[PDB]
Symmetry: D3
Subunit: 252 residues, 6 copies
Amino acid sequence: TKTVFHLGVTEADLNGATLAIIPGDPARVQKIAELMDNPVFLASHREYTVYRAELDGQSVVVCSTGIGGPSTSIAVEELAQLGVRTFLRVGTTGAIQPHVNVGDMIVTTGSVRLDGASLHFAPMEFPAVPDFDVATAMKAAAQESGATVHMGVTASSDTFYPGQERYDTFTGRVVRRFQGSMKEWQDMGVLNFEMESATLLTMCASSGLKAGCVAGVIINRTQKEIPDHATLKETEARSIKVVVEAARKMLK
Amino acid sequence: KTVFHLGVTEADLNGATLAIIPGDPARVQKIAELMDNPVFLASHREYTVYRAELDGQSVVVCSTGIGGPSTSIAVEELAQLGVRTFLRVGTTGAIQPHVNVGDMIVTTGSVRLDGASLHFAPMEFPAVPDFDVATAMKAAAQESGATVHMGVTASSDTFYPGQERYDTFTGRVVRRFQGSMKEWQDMGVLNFEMESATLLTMCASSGLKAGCVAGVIINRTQKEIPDHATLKETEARSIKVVVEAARKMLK
Amino acid sequence: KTVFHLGVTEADLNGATLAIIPGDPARVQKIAELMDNPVFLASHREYTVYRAELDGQSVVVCSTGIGGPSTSIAVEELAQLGVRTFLRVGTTGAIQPHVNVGDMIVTTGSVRLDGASLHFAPMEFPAVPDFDVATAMKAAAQESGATVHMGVTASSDTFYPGQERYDTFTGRVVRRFQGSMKEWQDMGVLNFEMESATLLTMCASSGLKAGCVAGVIINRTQKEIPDHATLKETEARSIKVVVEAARKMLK
Amino acid sequence: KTVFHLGVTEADLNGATLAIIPGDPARVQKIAELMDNPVFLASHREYTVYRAELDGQSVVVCSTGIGGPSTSIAVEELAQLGVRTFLRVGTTGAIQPHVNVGDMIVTTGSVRLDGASLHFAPMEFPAVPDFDVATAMKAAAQESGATVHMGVTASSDTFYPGQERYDTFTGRVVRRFQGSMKEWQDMGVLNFEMESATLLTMCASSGLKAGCVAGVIINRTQKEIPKETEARSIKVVVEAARKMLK
Amino acid sequence: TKTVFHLGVTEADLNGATLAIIPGDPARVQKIAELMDNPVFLASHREYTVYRAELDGQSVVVCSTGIGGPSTSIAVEELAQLGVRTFLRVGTTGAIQPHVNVGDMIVTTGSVRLDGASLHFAPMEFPAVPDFDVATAMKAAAQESGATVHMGVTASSDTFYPGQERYDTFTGRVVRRFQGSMKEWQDMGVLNFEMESATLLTMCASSGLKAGCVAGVIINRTQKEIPDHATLKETEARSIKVVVEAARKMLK
Amino acid sequence: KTVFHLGVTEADLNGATLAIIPGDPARVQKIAELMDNPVFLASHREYTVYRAELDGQSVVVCSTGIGGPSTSIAVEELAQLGVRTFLRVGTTGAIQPHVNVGDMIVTTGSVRLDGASLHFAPMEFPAVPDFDVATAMKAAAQESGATVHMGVTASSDTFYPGQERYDTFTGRVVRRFQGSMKEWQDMGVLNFEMESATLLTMCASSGLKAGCVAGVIINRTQKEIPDKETEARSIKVVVEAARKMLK
Ligand SMILES: [Mg+2]
Ligand SMILES: [Mg+2]
Ligand code: NA
Ligand code: NA
Ligand code: NA
Ligand code: NA
Ligand code: NA
Ligand code: NA
Ligand code: NA
Ligand code: NA
Ligand code: NA
Ligand code: NA
Ligand code: NA
């Protein structure tokens, strides 16, 4: 049986799946899988929890990535070794534009590469861009849920704190590179911050894999950092329903 | 109030908020004549400017010249005069064996092998089209009956060393570009051209909507040589497609 | 108080100012149980947190996940809760023929093949441990009877191309990393891992004390699949060593 | 063979080894008519090409368009056809208060604020003219009676943000270029234009002789947006060409 | 048999020395050598003055480097060609931290690479770090002298003026890269500026050579208290006493 | 007021506004003695300083040591004391087969393979000489009867790997510099040395006039390590170039 170093699954375990839904949080894996048919737990090791399920009769993998490009790059590579070719990222995000409201959804059309792992696949000049079919399916699924949907650029940072220009920290300092950066991205039309899309999109677009990202907005950095619990719960539930419908459209 | 290089005023554009931007000044009139009431506005340097009407709405056609620098001037000055949507059209060579002469490429992102893009956003920023423009271009290209490829384009400030051409005066390619064509091929890049990184980066970071569509007229991975009829048909299809994409963008 | 990700409060740490930070959440309980009164505090995402007591002093054990990004969150949030000293423990792959499986490595500096270190200091800044922590780790490792190497570690944001692995889906390694393992070997680099550049740069530029100790589980010049009993012995020794290094840091 | 963009053959050039390269295609005939027997060769895109004779020797005049990319095509294709010396003439905006409109500038080196230069040499390489060309341009400019400055030119891939112009659609300039005009002024840079970094780097790294001479049409300490001094500039470049051909 | 090109010495001249003490100033070479047994002048060319001496019966070289990484890189290379494997840098320095006092000693644990020559040996990602044994010996020797010792990061600049953010200069200008840089390094915990350690440490750590740096503090830019003649002469003398004792510990 | 490193005052320079700056302190007296009334001013570290008179005007001669860092100190401190024109003289290794031992090179621009230039101007800025100085150096070199080349010089922070030398302790050259000699040769670069990028960038961005002239002592197409007429000719040329710069 062909094995992988980290994910603890074999190709046979995936029952022919060529599409994976890849949340960051291992606890979200079962929640996504149960929206599909016959969900089965496969493995859990480190930040990687893996389930299989069936969508319109076709096998689909759900696999967490952990936070950050490095752990994401391992999961994507090992799933690709086992036959996966399409990767649908789902999560929640913090918007930086005043016109993007908490509870809206964002489909990334390109990422600002504020990461390191993307450079291990392509030099900085290469665009961190989704597959067009995936982005199209995500937009359609997000609109069909009734959400307000934004298509646009996402800033993808290797840190939660200084690289997103947060000052409420142990040192209260932000290195020169990132001082004033939130305003710069705002002025350039960037919609939101997250921590994995630059790696995911660059890796996949340079390796013959299809990828995209969809996210529900849980905070707006121009407003407040502490989300309201009921609003957050509704946004999380809608986001995973949307990504499953986007997967259905990709497997049509 | 006349913009410095293009030699037109806002009133000359008759309310147009969309421009079709070919590189070659001689193609401007040909595109304008696919629409209604084409009117010559100005010609200076590489910038020939026409207006026309598409479903009753004014549209500008303006050439850019070769390269990001001359393109950046045209986009800026058109934006000063109210243009918000920019549709690049042209023909191109492909670098993938599965892309055939006569197919169409709609760029989903560009490798920034240029300098002017950096005058608008740092290198980390993606040279990506507006999603509505890319969607309209894909639809128009597919409705034409052509085979359409969505993917990455390598956008070079040179025709020769930055496209790893060795049939040159020196035969030299600087270290940065040695082996680069195979690298881009292995990364799935569809084609080289010379303006999209500047155009897409400038527009995506400035509140403007842009995209690129091109007909494939040569493939340097293929031994077969296309004939004159196929090349003429491809050039003609490329501009018919961009006009239909403009139609889809009108509100 | 409250932190965004770790789900613990300052009160939960019972005055701890030192943390042992493995990568794998499953190792946290194993480390905590080498000390007195281990208490499970929280588990969320890749972050499992325990407290224990070492010579009567509270110590926190907190996993980081794989990579600089998740590590940077844990270190920041622990620092918000009063932690000032961070002891990284784990297993590693050596790249030097003279470093044997079962040896231990204490990092004296890291090659910054990551992105998160740049969010704390520009590339010119050295990814260097605190001298007291490195000294304590060397002493603990040597006192255990292990063969110990002090030297430079290459710290990569990827497991695959950034460590020049070719047995992959594409079999390709980007130009930057082609030939890189031989380059690091020739420069005397001991091993690869994926968190030290971020950890050491963040701490050395932020007034925090950090170091890294690791047991060698593979040698890249030999084989990729480790022998089970040898690996188990090395893992057990590594966490015993880091606990003794923590003992040496207590004041 | 006929080169891909310029539409001319080696035979069309009648043995010319020197080219004068203005940016604007409309200036090509104006330069050519200052010499003997000017003949139109071709026009395609931004490239208009004439041949003429100077002291009995064939000379090419070929426009480049705006920017390093289109310039790099013209220089390469002319070099394929035997041209070895390239004399750039154009206009420029001064950034030093003491340089006045109508003055002339001969570039001794360019700040590489372009992309195409990097397709010929890494950034460490100097964007420097051939010393004989720079010497001939200085002499020709002095002999015309103009006030001449030798010095460094900032060569930008954009007209707007890379020259720190703010009267624009966005009114914004990216971090790299904020405060850059003052920085170049403090470093003694004389002027801005858009082709010299590409031209000089490409030629100095490829065995070709190049230089640039320009007329000041605006002082950027005064404002952002701008016949004797266009006419004088092309008279000067033709005299510089005469000095280069023995 | 060969005579090295710049230093003008042969391997036989070194009488088997495998350790060198490398001050910057040629006039300090004899002062260091005379702290050991049987000091003998070997050669002087340009900024390179070379002596041999004996320490606990073992031959030791003392060789000046001149100011800056470039001239240092020549001396280290040519000594390595002649069998030298351990390099102990000694000098005096300013400090940029308020808690570092005149008369204290700094042992460098890593250097900020604000130089060019380090890049001729390893790319910027590589750490400018000392050999651990050398740093340990220098700490012990410095403590045994009675001085207060600081272990930490040093900023190593190719210039004395703009790269140390000095404005009292001919132009009064500091290029963008270095504006605000002193405060940045101070906030990052950097102890001091000097002009050779990044080159020395990077070259040696990437070439199989052991190196370290120790320096006595003779001025503090954050304090406007002028130390007197006595404390400065004492600090220079202590610095070289310390480096010789560190050499003794390396040869034990 | 005495500058920090050079050990001289403004009064010591007797109104000199031009300096000849060799690398080797032992060459300072030799250059000064080619002029009238040479006077030893100071020696400390790699900095030996003399004054002399050339056609009645005071000229300084000051060594720089090897490398951009020590050069940048000397140039700055001389500028603090009123010097505005800096004439670098020295030896060099040619990398073009048509340049012979004994020829002279006047640098028209330098490849910035150094670090100190970046402390004065970002990498995009050209390491170029003042045109008057380069013109005076070309004229002095040609009037001497020498074969003179104008062109680009590669200016390296190291003697060994940055000049792609392999007869070294490690026998290795870092990726950046592997194949670099051939690359510079193909790009028409004439020679290697170690100070011009710093000197020219510093001066061109600081309102100071600088240039470099050098005699060729080795051709790197022949061998790696060099093996007196040329040294003497080079300093005679730089003194005559100084004469041409005097106003
Ligand atoms: Mg406005
Ligand atoms: Mg050897
Ligand atoms: Na992780
Ligand atoms: Na709102
Ligand atoms: Na090569
Ligand atoms: Na947009
Ligand atoms: Na390769
Ligand atoms: Na153009
Ligand atoms: Na700013
Ligand atoms: Na020196
Ligand atoms: Na340059
Ligand atoms: Na190599
Ligand atoms: Na100047």
